[PDB]
Amino acid sequence: XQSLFQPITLGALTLKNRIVMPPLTRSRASQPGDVANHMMAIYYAQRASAGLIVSEGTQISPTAKGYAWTPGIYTPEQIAGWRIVTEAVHAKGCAIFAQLWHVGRVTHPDNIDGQQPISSSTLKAENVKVFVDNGSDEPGFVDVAVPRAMTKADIAQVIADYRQAALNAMEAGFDGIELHAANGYLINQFIDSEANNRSDEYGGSLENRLRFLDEVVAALVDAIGAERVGVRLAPLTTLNGTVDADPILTYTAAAALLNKHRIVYLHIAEVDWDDAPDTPVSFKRALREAYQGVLIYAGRYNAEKAEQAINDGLADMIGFGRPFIANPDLPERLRHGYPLAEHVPATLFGGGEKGLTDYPTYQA
Numbered sequence: 001x002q003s004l005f006q007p008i009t010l011g012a013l014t015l016k017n018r019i020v021m022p023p024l025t026r027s028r029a030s031q032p033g034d035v036a037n038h039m040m041a042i043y044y045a046q047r048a049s050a051g052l053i054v055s056e057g058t059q060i061s062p063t064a065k066g067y068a069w070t071p072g073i074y075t076p077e078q079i080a081g082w083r084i085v086t087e088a089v090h091a092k093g094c095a096i097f098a099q100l101w102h103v104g105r106v107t108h109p110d111n112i113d114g115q116q117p118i119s120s121s122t123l124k125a126e127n128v129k130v131f132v133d134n135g136s137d138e139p140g141f142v143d144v145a146v147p148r149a150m151t152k153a154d155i156a157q158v159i160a161d162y163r164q165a166a167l168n169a170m171e172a173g174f175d176g177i178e179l180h181a182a183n184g185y186l187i188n189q190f191i192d193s194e195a196n197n198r199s200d201e202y203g204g205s206l207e208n209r210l211r212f213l214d215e216v217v218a219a220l221v222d223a224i225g226a227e228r229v230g231v232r233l234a235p236l237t238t239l240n241g242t243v244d245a246d247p248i249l250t251y252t253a254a255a256a257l258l259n260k261h262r263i264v265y266l267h268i269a270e271v272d273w274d275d276a277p278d279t280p281v282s283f284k285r286a287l288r289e290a291y292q293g294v295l296i297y298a299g300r301y302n303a304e305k306a307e308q309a310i311n312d313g314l315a316d317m318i319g320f321g322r323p324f325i326a327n328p329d330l331p332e333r334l335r336h337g338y339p340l341a342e343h344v345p346a347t348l349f350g351g352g353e354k355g356l357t358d359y360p361t362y363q364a
């Protein structure tokens with residue numbers, strides 16, 4: 001754990017250690033309005049011994065939402081709710097980035113004001129569910145809907161929404177933003193060949209499939225500066241329905257594209273739930289050459305594997321998702337080898353403080 005507990009520079013920030021709390025949707029936002037709130041501020045502040053917190057995905061617009069009760073980042077009230085979170089986290093000595101979210105086709109009309117979802121194409125995500133508010137207090141799991149293909153004007157609108165969301169994140173006191181371009185969501189629906197059947201400049205070729213990513217990143221950087229922009233990618237997981245035919249080429253190219261933009265970090269989502277594909281070390285080393293900023297990995301890491309990934313030169317920082325839900329003091333536990341509590345799946349999403357802020361710190 002020695003390297004894990006070394007500080008690191010992230011742009012203008014000096015971070016305390018190499019541990020990341022990655023984005024974790026908890027579906028706790030206040031209703032009406034999808035507003036980040038008090039229990040969320042406590043929850044994040046409890047976990048501020050991380051070197052970096054990345055917020056749960058926060059939708060950039062009404063039609064960017066995939067799941068019931070996720071917090072937005074587009075209304076004044078939403079910005080203010082996030083400000084209480086960032087104030088709480090900063091009072092603990094910690095950096096926090098907002099994960100800007102557009103789910104594309106991974107949604108249901110019930111979550112997007114009755115609208116049809118949008119995507120690169122008209123392809124439904126196969127074997128994917130989201131959840132909606134069915135009036136009860138538990139999430140209602142539902143099949144996703146068939147999307148409509150984005151027009152040029154839709155592309156411009158979504159870019160504008162991302163750009164503004166980045167400014168809104170700065171107004172909310174975040175230290176930066178993370179673009180969610182992973183786990184089968186909108187940008188990923190353009191990147192991955194089998195999800196993109198466009199015949200315009202946003203599909204077919206590799207250059208074309210990376211174009212939407214390129215243009216979104218350019219707008220984010222123009223708005224808030226490259227030192228405040230991270231990006232999340234999922235080269236090899238396919239759980240939410242996006243498959244690429246040549247992911248080593250596509251994602252090495254994506255990494256090099258992002259390197260050109262000088263984004264402050266690249267975050268690889270190596271596992272999504274139970275989807276834990278073989279991610280060859282040779283490929284990780286290629287990503288390390290293609291992108292020369294801070295490289296973050298998350299997915300089924302423990303203390304041993306995290307330390308090894310850093311010492312092998314594969315990663316600079318490591319995120320721990322599920323363990324951070326149940327262990328607010330995860331860094332201390334990893335450092336000492338204290339046993340980790342396990343999380344309760346039934347309280348991941350929705351509800352209140354139970355299963356959110358009532359996981360204790362370690363006590364022998």
Ligand SMILES: Cc1cc2nc3c(=O)[nH]c(=O)nc-3n(C[C@H](O)[C@H](O)[C@H](O)COP(=O)(O)O)c2cc1C
Nearest residue numbers: 022023024025056057271298299300320321322348
């Ligand atoms: C409850 C839960 C919610 C999640 N929601 C998001 C999210 O909002 N954005 C995201 O990029 N990943 C999300 N993820 C994925 C995690 O960031 C992480 O990559 C994944 O859980 C693998 O890491 P782990 O094995 O350490 O949990 C979520 C994971 C969990 C368990």
Ligand SMILES: CCCCCCCCO[C@@H]1O[C@H](CO)[C@@H](O)[C@H](O)[C@H]1O
Nearest residue numbers: 025067183239240272273345346348
């Ligand atoms: C009862 C708890 C059910 C846990 C099973 C999780 C259902 C899907 O969970 C979803 O996973 C996505 C990544 O695939 C995330 O981006 C979303 O934030 C999350 O809501």
